[PDB]
Structure 1
Amino acid sequence: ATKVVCVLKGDGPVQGIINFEQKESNGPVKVWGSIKGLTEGLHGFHVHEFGDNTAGCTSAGPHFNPLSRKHGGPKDEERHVGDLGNVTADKDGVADVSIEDSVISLSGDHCIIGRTLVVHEKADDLGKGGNEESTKTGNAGSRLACGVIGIAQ
Protein backbone atom coordinates (compact mmCIF):
# COMPACT_ATOMS: atom_id res chain seq x y z
CA ALA A 1 0.00 0.00 0.00
CA THR A 2 2.44 2.68 1.37
CA LYS A 3 5.43 3.83 -0.81
CA VAL A 4 8.19 6.26 0.44
CA VAL A 5 11.40 7.49 -1.33
CA CYS A 6 14.75 9.07 -0.26
CA VAL A 7 17.21 11.13 -2.41
CA LEU A 8 20.75 10.80 -0.91
CA LYS A 9 22.89 13.99 -1.32
CA GLY A 10 26.02 15.30 0.47
CA ASP A 11 29.09 17.59 0.11
CA GLY A 12 30.95 14.91 -1.96
CA PRO A 13 30.14 13.03 -5.22
CA VAL A 14 28.00 10.29 -3.52
CA GLN A 15 24.31 10.50 -4.59
CA GLY A 16 21.48 7.93 -4.88
CA ILE A 17 17.70 7.23 -4.89
CA ILE A 18 16.32 4.59 -2.41
CA ASN A 19 12.65 3.42 -2.48
CA PHE A 20 10.76 1.75 0.43
CA GLU A 21 7.49 -0.25 -0.03
CA GLN A 22 5.41 -2.03 2.70
CA LYS A 23 2.32 -4.09 1.58
CA GLU A 24 1.02 -4.94 5.13
CA SER A 25 0.52 -2.53 8.12
CA ASN A 26 3.39 -4.33 10.02
CA GLY A 27 4.89 -6.66 7.38
CA PRO A 28 8.41 -6.52 5.84
CA VAL A 29 9.71 -3.32 4.10
CA LYS A 30 11.41 -3.72 0.65
CA VAL A 31 14.33 -1.20 0.46
CA TRP A 32 15.77 -0.92 -3.11
CA GLY A 33 17.51 1.64 -5.36
CA SER A 34 20.99 2.75 -6.55
CA ILE A 35 23.84 4.84 -4.98
CA LYS A 36 26.86 6.04 -7.08
CA GLY A 37 30.22 7.81 -6.41
CA LEU A 38 31.07 5.28 -3.62
CA THR A 39 34.48 3.63 -3.02
CA GLU A 40 34.35 -0.12 -4.01
CA GLY A 41 33.27 -2.33 -1.03
CA LEU A 42 30.94 -2.14 2.02
CA HIS A 43 29.29 1.10 3.30
CA GLY A 44 27.16 1.46 6.48
CA PHE A 45 23.45 1.99 5.63
CA HIS A 46 21.35 3.37 8.55
CA VAL A 47 18.12 5.26 9.29
CA HIS A 48 19.21 8.11 11.66
CA GLU A 49 16.76 9.72 14.17
CA PHE A 50 16.00 13.23 12.73
CA GLY A 51 14.83 14.44 9.28
CA ASP A 52 17.04 17.48 10.07
CA ASN A 53 19.61 18.65 7.42
CA THR A 54 20.14 22.16 8.97
CA ALA A 55 23.94 21.46 9.28
CA GLY A 56 24.29 18.67 6.64
CA CYS A 57 24.08 14.93 7.52
CA THR A 58 25.42 15.69 11.10
CA SER A 59 21.97 17.15 12.13
CA ALA A 60 20.33 13.69 11.51
CA GLY A 61 21.57 12.67 15.00
CA PRO A 62 22.32 9.01 15.90
CA HIS A 63 20.92 5.72 14.44
CA PHE A 64 17.08 5.65 14.98
CA ASN A 65 17.03 3.87 18.40
CA PRO A 66 13.49 4.07 19.92
CA LEU A 67 14.05 0.92 22.15
CA SER A 68 17.41 2.31 23.53
CA ARG A 69 19.47 -0.79 22.45
CA LYS A 70 23.15 -1.15 21.33
CA HIS A 71 24.24 -1.11 17.62
CA GLY A 72 24.14 -4.42 15.67
CA GLY A 73 23.62 -6.00 12.23
CA PRO A 74 20.04 -6.16 10.83
CA LYS A 75 19.84 -9.94 11.67
CA ASP A 76 20.88 -9.29 15.36
CA GLU A 77 18.06 -9.12 18.01
CA GLU A 78 20.21 -6.47 19.84
CA ARG A 79 20.14 -3.62 17.21
CA HIS A 80 18.91 -0.04 16.54
CA VAL A 81 15.65 0.10 14.45
CA GLY A 82 17.75 2.04 11.86
CA ASP A 83 20.53 -0.65 11.65
CA LEU A 84 20.02 -1.83 7.99
CA GLY A 85 23.66 -3.12 7.89
CA ASN A 86 25.82 -2.54 4.74
CA VAL A 87 25.36 -1.89 0.99
CA THR A 88 28.09 -3.15 -1.43
CA ALA A 89 29.48 -0.76 -4.13
CA ASP A 90 30.85 -2.56 -7.27
CA LYS A 91 34.23 -1.69 -8.95
CA ASP A 92 32.52 1.31 -10.76
CA GLY A 93 31.42 2.76 -7.33
CA VAL A 94 27.68 1.86 -7.81
CA ALA A 95 25.74 0.08 -4.99
CA ASP A 96 22.60 -1.68 -6.41
CA VAL A 97 20.60 -1.76 -3.12
CA SER A 98 18.01 -4.52 -2.39
CA ILE A 99 17.16 -5.19 1.32
CA GLU A 100 14.13 -6.73 3.13
CA ASP A 101 13.79 -5.58 6.80
CA SER A 102 10.98 -6.31 9.34
CA VAL A 103 12.20 -4.01 12.23
CA ILE A 104 11.80 -0.72 10.25
CA SER A 105 8.20 0.18 9.19
CA LEU A 106 6.33 2.88 7.16
CA SER A 107 3.73 3.00 10.06
CA GLY A 108 3.68 2.64 13.91
CA ASP A 109 6.33 3.59 16.55
CA HIS A 110 9.10 2.19 14.23
CA CYS A 111 8.00 4.54 11.34
CA ILE A 112 11.07 5.95 9.44
CA ILE A 113 9.01 8.58 7.45
CA GLY A 114 10.36 12.11 8.20
CA ARG A 115 13.69 10.55 9.38
CA THR A 116 17.07 10.46 7.54
CA LEU A 117 18.66 7.60 5.51
CA VAL A 118 22.52 7.86 5.60
CA VAL A 119 25.22 5.99 3.57
CA HIS A 120 28.57 6.07 5.48
CA GLU A 121 32.32 6.32 4.59
CA LYS A 122 33.32 2.73 5.65
CA ALA A 123 31.82 -0.74 6.37
CA ASP A 124 29.49 -1.12 9.39
CA ASP A 125 31.35 -3.69 11.63
CA LEU A 126 27.88 -4.84 12.95
CA GLY A 127 29.00 -4.27 16.61
CA LYS A 128 31.94 -6.78 16.43
CA GLY A 129 34.79 -4.17 16.39
CA GLY A 130 35.59 -4.56 20.13
CA ASN A 131 35.36 -0.81 21.04
CA GLU A 132 32.71 1.66 22.35
CA GLU A 133 32.21 3.12 18.81
CA SER A 134 31.42 -0.39 17.36
CA THR A 135 28.39 -0.72 19.77
CA LYS A 136 27.17 2.86 18.88
CA THR A 137 27.93 3.51 15.13
CA GLY A 138 29.54 0.20 13.91
CA ASN A 139 32.68 2.31 13.04
CA ALA A 140 31.08 3.21 9.64
CA GLY A 141 32.70 6.69 9.97
CA SER A 142 31.57 9.93 8.25
CA ARG A 143 28.17 10.53 6.54
CA LEU A 144 28.89 10.69 2.75
CA ALA A 145 25.23 11.41 1.75
CA CYS A 146 21.76 11.56 3.39
CA GLY A 147 18.11 12.48 2.64
CA VAL A 148 14.80 12.91 4.53
CA ILE A 149 12.46 9.91 3.91
CA GLY A 150 9.30 11.25 2.21
CA ILE A 151 5.94 10.02 0.84
CA ALA A 152 6.30 8.94 -2.85
CA GLN A 153 3.89 8.94 -5.87
Structure 2
Amino acid sequence: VQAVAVLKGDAGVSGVVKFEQASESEPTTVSYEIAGNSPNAERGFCIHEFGDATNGCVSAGPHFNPFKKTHGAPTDEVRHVGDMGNVKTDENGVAKGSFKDSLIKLIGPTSVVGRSVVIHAGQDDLGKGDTEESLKTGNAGPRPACGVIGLTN
Protein backbone atom coordinates (compact mmCIF):
# COMPACT_ATOMS: atom_id res chain seq x y z
CA VAL A 1 0.00 0.00 0.00
CA GLN A 2 0.99 3.59 -0.61
CA ALA A 3 -0.72 6.68 0.79
CA VAL A 4 -0.03 10.39 0.50
CA ALA A 5 -1.02 13.68 2.10
CA VAL A 6 -0.60 17.14 0.58
CA LEU A 7 -0.18 19.58 3.47
CA LYS A 8 -1.84 22.97 2.97
CA GLY A 9 -2.88 26.07 4.87
CA ASP A 10 -2.90 29.85 4.67
CA ALA A 11 0.39 30.36 6.52
CA GLY A 12 3.08 29.85 3.90
CA VAL A 13 3.63 26.23 4.92
CA SER A 14 2.99 23.42 2.43
CA GLY A 15 4.42 20.00 1.80
CA VAL A 16 3.88 16.44 0.83
CA VAL A 17 3.99 13.42 3.07
CA LYS A 18 4.17 9.87 1.74
CA PHE A 19 3.38 6.58 3.44
CA GLU A 20 4.29 3.05 2.42
CA GLN A 21 3.59 -0.32 3.97
CA ALA A 22 3.90 -3.70 2.19
CA SER A 23 2.24 -5.94 4.76
CA GLU A 24 0.45 -5.19 8.03
CA SER A 25 3.12 -6.54 10.39
CA GLU A 26 5.75 -4.57 8.46
CA PRO A 27 6.69 -0.99 9.53
CA THR A 28 5.44 1.99 7.56
CA THR A 29 8.03 4.18 5.87
CA VAL A 30 6.97 7.84 6.19
CA SER A 31 8.74 10.25 3.85
CA TYR A 32 8.26 14.02 4.03
CA GLU A 33 9.11 17.23 2.21
CA ILE A 34 7.80 20.38 3.91
CA ALA A 35 8.52 24.05 3.22
CA GLY A 36 7.69 27.46 4.55
CA ASN A 37 8.66 26.71 8.15
CA SER A 38 10.85 28.81 10.48
CA PRO A 39 14.52 28.07 9.61
CA ASN A 40 16.69 25.79 11.73
CA ALA A 41 13.88 24.74 14.03
CA GLU A 42 12.03 21.63 15.26
CA ARG A 43 8.35 21.29 14.52
CA GLY A 44 5.74 18.90 15.90
CA PHE A 45 4.69 16.40 13.24
CA CYS A 46 1.59 14.24 13.82
CA ILE A 47 -1.42 12.21 12.60
CA HIS A 48 -4.76 13.44 13.89
CA GLU A 49 -7.89 11.35 14.21
CA PHE A 50 -10.12 12.86 11.56
CA GLY A 51 -9.66 13.48 7.87
CA ASP A 52 -12.19 16.28 8.14
CA ALA A 53 -11.08 19.50 6.49
CA THR A 54 -14.30 21.36 6.76
CA ASN A 55 -12.79 23.77 9.26
CA GLY A 56 -9.09 24.29 8.46
CA CYS A 57 -6.81 22.04 10.49
CA VAL A 58 -9.13 22.41 13.43
CA SER A 59 -11.58 19.77 12.25
CA ALA A 60 -8.74 17.17 12.22
CA GLY A 61 -9.49 16.50 15.89
CA PRO A 62 -7.07 15.21 18.54
CA HIS A 63 -4.08 12.92 18.06
CA PHE A 64 -4.89 9.50 16.59
CA ASN A 65 -4.78 7.38 19.77
CA PRO A 66 -6.80 4.13 19.54
CA PHE A 67 -5.08 2.63 22.59
CA LYS A 68 -5.82 5.65 24.73
CA LYS A 69 -2.23 6.29 25.90
CA THR A 70 -0.61 9.63 26.71
CA HIS A 71 1.32 11.67 24.18
CA GLY A 72 5.00 10.84 23.92
CA ALA A 73 8.00 10.46 21.62
CA PRO A 74 8.02 8.12 18.54
CA THR A 75 10.46 5.88 20.41
CA ASP A 76 8.56 5.86 23.69
CA GLU A 77 6.70 2.72 24.72
CA VAL A 78 3.87 5.01 25.75
CA ARG A 79 2.88 7.35 22.98
CA HIS A 80 -0.11 8.00 20.74
CA VAL A 81 -0.13 5.98 17.50
CA GLY A 82 -0.12 9.31 15.65
CA ASP A 83 2.97 10.71 17.43
CA MET A 84 5.71 11.39 14.86
CA GLY A 85 7.61 13.81 17.10
CA ASN A 86 9.54 16.74 15.61
CA VAL A 87 10.92 17.28 12.15
CA LYS A 88 14.08 19.38 11.82
CA THR A 89 13.96 22.37 9.42
CA ASP A 90 16.99 23.73 7.58
CA GLU A 91 18.42 27.16 6.99
CA ASN A 92 15.63 27.74 4.49
CA GLY A 93 12.64 26.43 6.50
CA VAL A 94 12.53 23.03 4.81
CA ALA A 95 11.93 19.75 6.64
CA LYS A 96 12.76 16.72 4.49
CA GLY A 97 13.55 13.15 5.42
CA SER A 98 11.95 9.87 6.27
CA PHE A 99 11.71 7.20 8.90
CA LYS A 100 9.93 3.97 9.61
CA ASP A 101 7.37 3.36 12.29
CA SER A 102 5.86 0.20 13.72
CA LEU A 103 2.66 1.75 15.15
CA ILE A 104 1.61 3.78 12.08
CA LYS A 105 -0.23 1.52 9.65
CA LEU A 106 -2.03 1.65 6.32
CA ILE A 107 -3.49 -1.83 6.79
CA GLY A 108 -5.79 -3.16 9.50
CA PRO A 109 -8.20 -1.65 12.07
CA THR A 110 -5.82 1.19 12.97
CA SER A 111 -5.11 2.30 9.39
CA VAL A 112 -4.30 5.99 8.99
CA VAL A 113 -5.96 6.19 5.54
CA GLY A 114 -8.71 8.82 5.71
CA ARG A 115 -7.13 10.60 8.71
CA SER A 116 -5.04 13.77 8.84
CA VAL A 117 -1.37 14.62 8.95
CA VAL A 118 -0.62 17.92 10.68
CA ILE A 119 2.52 20.08 10.77
CA HIS A 120 2.68 22.37 13.86
CA ALA A 121 4.00 25.91 14.26
CA GLY A 122 5.89 24.90 17.37
CA GLN A 123 8.14 22.26 18.83
CA ASP A 124 6.61 19.13 20.38
CA ASP A 125 7.74 18.76 24.00
CA LEU A 126 7.55 14.98 23.50
CA GLY A 127 5.18 14.72 26.43
CA LYS A 128 8.07 15.60 28.75
CA GLY A 129 6.96 19.08 29.64
CA ASP A 130 5.42 19.12 33.08
CA THR A 131 1.88 20.38 32.56
CA GLU A 132 -1.22 18.43 31.56
CA GLU A 133 -1.18 19.68 27.96
CA SER A 134 2.12 17.87 27.57
CA LEU A 135 0.55 14.41 27.92
CA LYS A 136 -2.34 15.51 25.75
CA THR A 137 -0.62 17.30 22.93
CA GLY A 138 3.06 18.01 23.52
CA ASN A 139 2.37 21.76 23.42
CA ALA A 140 3.33 22.01 19.72
CA GLY A 141 1.05 25.01 19.19
CA PRO A 142 -0.97 26.06 16.10
CA ARG A 143 -1.53 23.85 13.02
CA PRO A 144 -0.32 25.91 10.03
CA ALA A 145 -0.88 23.08 7.51
CA CYS A 146 -2.58 19.71 7.23
CA GLY A 147 -3.81 17.13 4.78
CA VAL A 148 -6.02 14.05 4.50
CA ILE A 149 -4.08 10.83 3.89
CA GLY A 150 -5.43 9.38 0.66
CA LEU A 151 -4.64 6.24 -1.35
CA THR A 152 -2.43 6.19 -4.41
CA ASN A 153 -0.30 3.90 -6.53
How high is the TM-score relative to the length of structure 1?
0.97
- The match for 1:26 is 25
- SS across alignment from 2:88: strand
Structure 1: gaps spanning 5 or more residues? none
Q: Deviations over 1:57-96 (max 9, x none)?
A: 0000000011111100010111111001111110100101
CA apart distance, 1:152: 1.2
The one-character-per-residue Cα deviations of 1:12-34 (angstroms, maximum 9, x if unpaired) are 10000111011222210010121
Q: Which moved more, 1:59-68 or 1:19-28?
A: 19-28
CA distance in 2, matches of 1:97, 1:45: 12
Q: CA deviation at 1:97?
A: 2.6
Q: Which residue of 1 aligns with 2:129?
A: 129
Identity of aligned residues (%): 54
Query: Does structure 1 conserve the Cα–Cα contact (< 8 Å) formed by 2:32 and 2:98?
Result: yes
Shift of 1:11: 1.5
Aligned to 1:76: 76
- Partners of 1:48 and 1:111 in 2: CA distance: 12
Q: Secondary structure at the match of 1:143?
A: coil
Which residue is 2:146 aligned to? 146
The alignment's C-alpha RMSD in Å is 0.8
Residue 151 of structure 1 and its aligned partner are, at CA, apart by 0.3
TM-score (ref. length: structure 2)? 0.97
In the aligned structure 1, how far is the partner of 2:96 from the partner of 2:151?
Answer: 22
Unaligned runs of 5+ in 2: none
Q: Distance in 2 between matches of 1:96 and 1:77?
A: 25
Which is richer in strand?
1
2: CA distance between counterparts of 1:33 and 1:103?
17
Match in the other structure for 1:9: 8
Structure 1 segments of 4+ aligned residues over 6 angstroms from their partners: none
Q: Distance in 1 between matches of 2:101 and 2:122?
A: 21
